Amino acid sequence: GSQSTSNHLWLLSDILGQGATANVFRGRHKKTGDLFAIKVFNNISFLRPVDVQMREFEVLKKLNHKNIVKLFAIEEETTTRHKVLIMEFCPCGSLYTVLEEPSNAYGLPESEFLIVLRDVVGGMNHLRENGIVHRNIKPGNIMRVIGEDGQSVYKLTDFGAARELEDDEQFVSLYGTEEYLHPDMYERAVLRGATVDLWSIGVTFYHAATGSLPFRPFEGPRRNKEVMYKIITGKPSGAISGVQKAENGPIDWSGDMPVSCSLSRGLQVLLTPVLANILEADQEKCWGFDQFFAETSDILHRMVIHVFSLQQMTAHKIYIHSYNTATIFHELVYKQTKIISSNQELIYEGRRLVLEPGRLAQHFPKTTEENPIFVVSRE
Amino acid sequence: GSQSTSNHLWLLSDILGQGATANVFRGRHKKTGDLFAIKVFNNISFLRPVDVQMREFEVLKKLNHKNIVKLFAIEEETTTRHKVLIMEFCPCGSLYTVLEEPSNAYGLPESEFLIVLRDVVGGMNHLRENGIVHRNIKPGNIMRVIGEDGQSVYKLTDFGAARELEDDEQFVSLYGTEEYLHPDMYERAVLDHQKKYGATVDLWSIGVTFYHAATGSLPFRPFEGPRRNKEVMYKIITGKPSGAISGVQKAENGPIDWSGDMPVSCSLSRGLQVLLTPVLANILEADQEKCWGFDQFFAETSDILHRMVIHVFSLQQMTAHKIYIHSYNTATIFHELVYKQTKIISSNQELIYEGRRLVLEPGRLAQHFPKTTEENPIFVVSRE
Ligand SMILES: O=C(NCCCNc1nc(Nc2cccc(NC(=O)N3CCCC3)c2)ncc1I)c1cccs1
Ligand SMILES: O=C(NCCCNc1nc(Nc2cccc(NC(=O)N3CCCC3)c2)ncc1I)c1cccs1
């Protein structure tokens, strides 16, 4: 069948998404023919507590960002009178289907990954500025939109398990007397969450970088659930992935990106610390947000100088800040090349290149994979 | 100063209750003049997420029981149009004020206590049947109402911190796929963690409440009292050896005196204490894997409520004894309970009732024993 509102119309066979509590359909405005995604809650859904039901509406009401799938309106279904959500339609689908593309079997292209990095981060920041916590971030609900400039824009959606956090202050005054409180209640209301998203993002970022999941059972994630729980909960600090090659074999843990990572070493080495800190179940040790945004911004504010090592026959991306000196450039070159700065001899556009030790990165000549700054070691 | 709605009117001076997010006032209905309690929220309270604000209302919409303060209507205040709660008014007040009665300084009388036990369990069962957790139960919240027989009825109220908890079991794959879920989320995604947790916090509060009612004292007492010294309070509640039902700080910065038993000054029969302490001990456990479930709690407490009393008097020590026994319990178990309180070996146990040696058949049921009273009790002497 079909359903509608006074402004929109959709067919139930036009499913875009299915979940425990709701479906999302592709609909059209009755007068313009403009496309929208309509989220409609199911009967099961109405058995949850009313205040829980109210959460998503309240969360989406708070958000308006380029990296959050846009809420256009809340309308009433003509027959049921049930409130539905009218949202931005993203005909390209999600980071899920992108990752299904073969060309992306060992990770997104470096530029597209950086896009993912920028947009997911921008979305998180927005959730954080609004006291929101999503709790179920996955490639499947990070939607892709081809922007004005032909470039992808990513946008978060599916805030079904989301909720607003509050500072404790409103709760505490709430209990007058403490003599009857449970220890936990006491701890919470007398003496004195969000990091769950950071974990999901960490895993999402891992998947985008490698085409693989960081933690997986030998049998695969869906089938071995016991194993999975031990892996993520028994994870050595600093580790980024743990895999089981054995039927009931031990977990091979790693602190670095796998060898087939689609990203340059330049970026791998920046990305790793970020993952290691967010993929920390112990809330004590996981990064807080202000640090997460700061470290990722530090990745995104860098420019790239393309280097090619002629002695090693390898290509390199140097992630440097526009204000960084040449001294620093050479140091970043050594970090990947293992050619001491003293022995680094450069060549640009067929002629030898010499850099004042105090020149600035934004005044280096323009480089490209096709036209890089060559390095060689001169003993 | 005063406020109003279409139907009710209250004077700001007539405050019945006062808290962080709301006040409760005594009002009258504009036509009938019937008294009611009215809960009015403060502005600060509206800074909370709307869904949180909703809860108390959505809770009170679900509840209907004799042990839960009744909701009459949700109306709007005339000047602000904010929603207010029209509630059953309880002139008598709460279990808290009852316990402020001099005669209750060492606990309630067995008769009230048993009533308090029954009602609280009844209400807590209603909450549990509706997935609710109160979270802030205390004598101050437990309202007292005179029933038709002149007997007390107790009723829960003040659901300011309450919420209705989702049963995770009811749905399949609430979260679509798990590969990206934080471990806590994964747990909820595949494992009654939240419902089992929320449940216990009310059990604890109920424990402290019953201990208070039975003794006139709080079980966990820093030397300066709970309000004065929160670090110790916490250490005591957090550091309590299992089986312990109280911890008291006798002196300043002194060690703690732990007890697994009721204090000797307790106003309850030993018959009742022996039954109550294991209940107190298993709900006053901070340890999730050690504490009782709700089901045990209900089974164990109803075990107490569905026992009959047989009044015995021991000629040995000249003392009276309440013997808590099930209508289906046998003579065998009766002499057992008697010895536990009397120390008279079962065999030496010679009984006298209404001036005649009582010969209990070996297997007859405690339902077919003589009806006793504190005034007409079975006497028991040793035949040595
Ligand atoms: O939201 C959810 N899940 C997120 C998805 C559904 N929800 C929305 N979906 C779109 N757009 C969309 C959807 C599906 C497929 C596609 N297209 C493709 O996949 N293509 C086309 C080109 C290659 C493959 C686009 N917009 C806005 C929304 I809100 C939920 C699932 C269960 C409860 S909620
Ligand atoms: O709910 C709360 N606190 C619980 C109570 C307030 N709320 C209600 N209160 C009554 N009745 C009532 C109350 C207080 C006192 C009395 N009477 C006395 O104290 N007496 C009478 C004789 C001697 C002293 C009666 N009914 C229904 C309700 I809802 C809150 C405190 C802060 C926010 S909420």
The full DSSP string for A306-371 is EEEETTTTEEEEEEE-TT-BHHHHHHHHHHHH---GGGEEEEETTEEE---TT-BGGGSPP--SSS
CATH architecture of A92-301: Orthogonal Bundle (1.10)
Rounded distance between C-alpha atoms, residue B238 and residue B255, angstroms: 15
Q: What are the b/e assignments for B345-358, b being 16+ CB within 10 Å?
A: eeebbbbebeeeee
Please identify among residues 2-21 of chain B the ones whose CB lies closer than 8 Å to any CB of chain A: 19-21
Residues forming CATH 1.10.510.10 domain(s) in chain B: 92-306
What lies within 8 Å, CB to CB, of B148 at 6+ separation is none
CA triple A116-A283-A165, angle to 5 deg: 75
The three-state secondary structure class of B263 is coil
Task: Give the pair of three-digit tokens for residue B313.
Answer: 């008097």
Subunit contact A185:B201, Cβ cutoff 8 A: yes
What lies within 8 Å, CB to CB, of A375 at 6+ separation is A307, A308, A309, A310, A333, A337, A339, A344, A345, A346, A347
Instruction: Indicate the angle between helix axes B193-215 and B294-305, nearest 10 degrees.
Output: 30
Please identify among residues 172-201 of chain B the ones whose CB lies closer than 8 Å to any CB of chain A: 172-187, 190, 197, 200-201
For domain B92-306, the CATH superfamily is Transferase(Phosphotransferase) domain 1 (1.10.510.10)
Sheet of A22-29, strand order: A2-4, A8-18, A22-29, A35-41, A83-88, A71-76
User: B240 - beta bridge partners?
Assistant: none
DSSP assigned state of B260? S
Are the C-beta atoms of residues B165 and B131 closer than 8 Å to each other? yes
A219 burial level (CB within 10 Å; 0-12, 13-18, 19+): middle
Residues forming CATH 3.10.20.90 domain(s) in chain A: 302-379
CA triple B72-B75-B77, angle to 5 deg: 135
The three-state secondary structure class of A69 is coil
A26 burial level (CB within 10 Å; 0-12, 13-18, 19+): middle
Cα of A93 vs centre of ligand 1, distance in Å, is 5
Rounded distance between C-alpha atoms, residue A135 and residue B183, angstroms: 11
Task: Give the pair of three-digit tokens for residue A77.
Answer: 């279904």
Rounded distance between C-alpha atoms, residue B335 and residue A15, angstroms: 72
Rounded distance between C-alpha atoms, residue B181 and residue A113, angstroms: 21
Residues forming CATH 1.10.510.10 domain(s) in chain A: 92-301
What lies within 8 Å, CB to CB, of A146 at 6+ separation is A92, A152, A153
Selection from A362, B62, A336 nearest residue B54 by Cα: B62
Selection from B264, B231, B229, B263 nearest residue B246 by Cα: B263
Rounded distance between C-alpha atoms, residue B211 and residue B219, angstroms: 7
What lies within 8 Å, CB to CB, of A161 at 6+ separation is A134, A135, A136, B174, B175
Phi first, then psi: give them for residue B5, nearest 5 degrees.
-145, -170
H or E element in which residue B283 lies: helix B270-283
A80 burial level (CB within 10 Å; 0-12, 13-18, 19+): exposed
Rounded distance between C-alpha atoms, residue B90 and residue B146, angstroms: 9
Closest-approach residue (CA) in chain B for A197: B182
Q: Which of B135, B164, B174 sits opposite A49 (nearest CB)?
A: B164
* Chain A residues within an 8 Å CB radius of B54: 50-51, 54
Q: Which of A136, A183, A215 sits opposite B237 (nearest CB)?
A: A183
CA triple B214-B215-B221, angle to 5 deg: 125
Task: Give the pair of three-digit tokens for residue B221.
Answer: 């007492």
Subunit contact A177:B140, Cβ cutoff 8 A: yes
Residues forming CATH 3.30.200.20 domain(s) in chain B: 1-91
Nearest residue by C-alpha to atom 19 in ligand 1: A93
What is the full DSSP assignment across B36-91? EEEEEE-GGGGGS-HHHHHHHHHHHHH---TTBPPEEEEEEBTTT--EEEEE---T
Q: Does B105 touch chain A (CB under 8 A)?
A: no
Phi first, then psi: give them for residue B321, nearest 5 degrees.
-145, 135
**Number of residues assigned to chain B:** 384
Beta strands in chain A (DSSP E): 2-4, 8-18, 22-29, 35-41, 71-76, 83-88, 132-133, 142-146, 152-156, 163-164, 215-216, 241-244, 251-254, 303-309, 314-320, 344-348, 351-353, 373-377
CATH architecture of A1-91: 2-Layer Sandwich (3.30)
What is the full DSSP assignment across B187-255? HHH---HHHHHHHHHHHHHHHHHHHHHHHSS-SEE-TT-TTT-HHHHHHHHHSPPTT--EEEE-STT--
Rounded distance between C-alpha atoms, residue B107 and residue A240, angstroms: 59
User: B358 - beta bridge partners?
Assistant: B351
Nearest residue by C-alpha to atom 4 in ligand 2: B141
What is the full DSSP assignment across A92-130? T-BHHHHHHSGGGTT---HHHHHHHHHHHHHHHHHHHHT
Strands B220-221 and B246-249: parallel
Subunit contact A225:B190, Cβ cutoff 8 A: yes
- Cα–chain center distance at A304: 21
Look at the domain B307-384 and name its fold. Answer: Ubiquitin-like (UB roll) (3.10.20)
**Overall CATH class of domain A302-379:** alpha beta
What lies within 8 Å, CB to CB, of A205 at 6+ separation is A116, A117, A120, A271, A274, A275
Q: Does A228 touch chain B (CB under 8 A)?
A: yes
Rounded distance between C-alpha atoms, residue B125 and residue B300, angstroms: 13
DSSP assigned state of A83? E
- Cα–chain center distance at B195: 19
Number of neighbours of residue A105 by Cβ within 10 angstroms: 13
Rounded distance between C-alpha atoms, residue B328 and residue B308, angstroms: 10
Selection from B39, B51, B103 nearest residue B75 by Cα: B39
Cα of B165 vs centre of ligand 1, distance in Å, is 30
Are the C-beta atoms of residues A327 and A319 closer than 8 Å to each other? no
Residues forming CATH 3.10.20.90 domain(s) in chain B: 307-384
The reported resolution of this PDB entry, expressed in Å, is: 2.6
Please identify among residues 123-142 of chain B the ones whose CB lies closer than 8 Å to any CB of chain A: 131, 135-140
Selection from B196, B173, B178 nearest residue A231 by Cα: B178
The three-state secondary structure class of B329 is coil
